[PDB]
Amino acid sequence: EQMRLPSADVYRFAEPDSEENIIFEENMQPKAGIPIIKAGTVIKLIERLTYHMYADPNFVRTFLTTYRSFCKPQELLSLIIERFEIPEPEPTEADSAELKRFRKEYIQPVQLRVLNVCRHWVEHHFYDFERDAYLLQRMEEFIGTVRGKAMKKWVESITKIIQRKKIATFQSSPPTVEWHISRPGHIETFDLLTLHPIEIARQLTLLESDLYRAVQPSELVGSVWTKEDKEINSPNLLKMIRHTTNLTLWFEKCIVETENLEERVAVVSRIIEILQVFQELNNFNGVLEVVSAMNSSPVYRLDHTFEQIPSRQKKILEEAHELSEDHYKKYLAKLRSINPPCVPFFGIYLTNILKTEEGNPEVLKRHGKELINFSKRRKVAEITGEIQQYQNQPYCLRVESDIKRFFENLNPMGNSMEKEFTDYLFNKSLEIEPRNPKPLPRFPKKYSYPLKSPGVRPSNPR
């Protein structure tokens, strides 16, 4: 009781399964009871992407996220069009019956699965079409070719999405914005100590949340942020990282340029208070900006400064430092338990994608034949999926556009190159707290306003 397909000579996808063209993982798919594909030929991967027996949403999402390493977009389109155009089996010696069954159980389902691939492709990976206008031409003339009455509504929905893609408020009340010494409107006085530490953390969390949410799988798959075209292929990731680096460096700069010891203790305390509220907001990128500044070689050596830090804030810092220890053991656990909104640290995802792609082969070989290693791609797609799960939920916090501007336009390096600037910071560190046995000098005060923090607790109730 099997269908009887055409011969492989006329229709390539009728070639039966064997050890030479498709292999499976021993376990069955989550929620669905479908086989997990380990590896296959591109013909077999496309057969299963558009399989007649059942729909496979997981395989579709994973395939369309990761296919570009083993198959070109133009090739993929040609293959699904080839898949769509199914010839009927030749008559045996006479003549319906098995012919009408073939139309009902092979042709019609497969054609719908092909349309679903196009829908998903156009909806979630439209960048393929933006970068290759001819790909979009071929798609539209193909979609216009589809006649079936059952196909009509799926075709019309695909067209709707194409037209939409061709053209590029809070749930509950957010808390009141906090001000310390700098008044609203007076951007000229804005600094580390004059803005309210709560609001520094909130506005950096909004910036860093947006930066996190803009990064797409297309910037990550194929490890493209490490290759020569990284500025072309991964601009939003790089913008995100450059901000993180910017602020780490700004924290370091604030510390080492505050030459008076008492004032430097106030500066470090305030940065630890900002870390406290980063931690309250689950901005782990923010947490690690501070921890990286504190472990930088210019700041780490300032034993006279950290001596005068209140014990409570030492423990806040030490706790945050421990997240990174033992290959992010505590960070990993803490991220898995907390719920959105949050801003995770991207670096771990970067390393894991890179190592996954570097540490597994692109192809497996069986009986001399070459199979595409799909399980490798699934593992990359699982990581990009985890990245996406924290991009959906926004923060219930009001933007303050002047404070936003201040941190966006922050530029602690200036016109200096990296080596030049980090040498400057370290030489400053040696000036303000010389190496033993040299005596500790005194330095005059630079801040004419009060050093006392307003704390990390909201000033009014709501």
Partner 1 sequence: MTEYKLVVVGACGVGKSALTIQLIQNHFVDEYDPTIEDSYRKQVVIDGETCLLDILDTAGQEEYSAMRDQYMRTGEGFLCVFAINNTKSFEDIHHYREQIKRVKDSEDVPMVLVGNKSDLPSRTVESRQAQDLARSYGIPFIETSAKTRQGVDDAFYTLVREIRKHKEK
Measured between alpha carbons, how far is residue 36 from residues 42, 50, 285, 361, 447 in Å?
Answer: 16, 15, 35, 18, 64
Closer Cβ to partner 1, 213 or 376, answer by number: 376
Burial class (CB in 10 A: 0-12, 13-18, 19+), 398: middle
Closer Cβ to partner 1, 324 or 453, answer by number: 324
CB of 66 to partner 1, least distance (A): 17
CB of 42 to partner 1, least distance (A): 21
SS3 state of residue 182: coil
Torsion angle defined by CA atoms of residues 33, 37, 38 and 44, in that order, rounded to the nearest 10 degrees: 160
CB of 234 to partner 1, least distance (A): 9
Closer Cβ to partner 1, 350 or 387, answer by number: 350
CB of 226 to partner 1, least distance (A): 4
CB of 23 to partner 1, least distance (A): 14
If one counts every other C-beta atom within 10 angstroms of the C-beta of residue 231, the result is 9
First-to-last alpha carbon distance for the chain, in angstroms, is 69
Closer Cβ to partner 1, 78 or 422, answer by number: 422
CB of 352 to partner 1, least distance (A): 5
The residue ranges of DSSP E strands in 6-165, in sequence order, are: 22-28, 35-40
Helix (H), strand (E), coil (C) string for 259-307: CCHHHHHHHHHHHHHHHHHHHHCCEHHHHHHHHHHHHCHHHHCCHHHHH
Residue 55 has which token pair? 């729909």
95 touches 25 (CB < 8 A): no
CB of 302 to partner 1, least distance (A): 13
- Interacting residue ranges for partner 1, rule: CB under 8 A: 223, 225-228, 238, 241-242, 244-245, 248-249, 252, 288, 291-293, 295-297, 300-301, 324, 327, 347, 350-356, 358-361, 379, 418-419, 426
Of the candidates 222, 270, 276, the residue with the CA atom closest to the CA atom of residue 250: 270
Closer Cβ to partner 1, 149 or 419, answer by number: 419
CB of 461 to partner 1, least distance (A): 38
Q: What letter does residue 23 receive in the DSSP assignment?
A: E
Give the pairing of strands 369-373 and 363-366. antiparallel
182 touches 195 (CB < 8 A): yes
Closer Cβ to partner 1, 193 or 425, answer by number: 425
SS3 state of residue 3: coil
CB of 28 to partner 1, least distance (A): 20
CB of 407 to partner 1, least distance (A): 16
Measured between alpha carbons, how far is residue 439 from residues 257, 258, 432, 436 in Å?
Answer: 19, 18, 11, 7
Residue 420 has which token pair? 């030049």
Q: What letter does residue 372 receive in the DSSP assignment?
A: E
If one counts every other C-beta atom within 10 angstroms of the C-beta of residue 27, the result is 8
Closer Cβ to partner 1, 254 or 353, answer by number: 353
Measured between alpha carbons, how far is residue 127 from residues 10, 73, 131, 319 in Å?
Answer: 33, 11, 6, 42
CB of 412 to partner 1, least distance (A): 10
Closer Cβ to partner 1, 27 or 401, answer by number: 27
Closer Cβ to partner 1, 16 or 359, answer by number: 359
Closer Cβ to partner 1, 184 or 347, answer by number: 347
C-alpha span between 30 and 14 (Å, rounded): 28
CA 406 to chain CA centroid, Å, is 25
Closer Cβ to partner 1, 157 or 375, answer by number: 375
C-alpha span between 72 and 292 (Å, rounded): 41
